[PDB]
C-alpha cells in the first residue's frame, strides 16, 4: 500500500509499504528516498510519536495516511 510522509517544508514523500512494516522499516524507506538517517527522524500521526518495534497496523495506520516527519 501507499502512504505519504510530509515534512516541515511541506514536501510530501510517497512510500510503498505493507501494514506489517515496523516504524523503523518505514524510517529506513525514508532514508532510501531522502538520505535522512532513521535516528534523526521522528514520525508522528494522530498526535502520537510512532515508536520503533510497532507496526503500521498496530497504530491502525491505513492506506494513504499522511505521517508527519520532524527531525531530531
UniProtKB/Swiss-Prot annotation:
Q: What is the effect of changing residue 65 to A?
A: Prevents phosphorylation in case of mitophagy. Decreased localization of PRKN to mitochondria
Phenotype for residue 72 to K: No effect on ADP-ribosylation
Cross-link Glycyl lysine isopeptide (Lys-Gly) (interchain with G-Cter in ubiquitin) maps to 6, 11, 27, 29, 33, 48, 63
Q: Which residues of the full protein are shown?
A: 1 to 72 of 229
Q: What does this protein do?
A: Exists either covalently attached to another protein, or free (unanchored). When covalently bound, it is conjugated to target proteins via an isopeptide bond either as a monomer (monoubiquitin), a polymer linked via different Lys residues of the ubiquitin (polyubiquitin chains) or a linear polymer linked via the initiator Met of the ubiquitin (linear polyubiquitin chains).
(Microbial infection) ADP-ribosylthreonine is found on: 66
- This protein's species is Homo sapiens
The outcome of changing residue 63 to R is: Abolishes HLTF-mediated polyubiquitination of PCNA
Protein name, UniProt field = Ubiquitin
Amino acid at each position: 500500500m501507499q502512504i505519504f510522509v510530509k515534512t516541515l517544508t511541506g514536501k510530501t514523500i510517497t512510500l510503498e509499504v505493507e501494514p506489517s512494516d515496523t516504524i523503523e522499516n518505514v524510517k529506513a524507506k525514508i532514508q532510501d528516498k531522502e538520505g535522512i538517517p532513521p535516528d534523526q527522524q521522528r514520525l508522528i500521526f494522530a498526535g502520537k510519536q510512532l515508536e520503533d518495534g510497532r507496526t503500521l497496523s498496530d497504530y491502525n495506520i491505513q492506506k494513504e495516511s499522511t505521517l508527519h516527519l520532524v527531525l531530531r
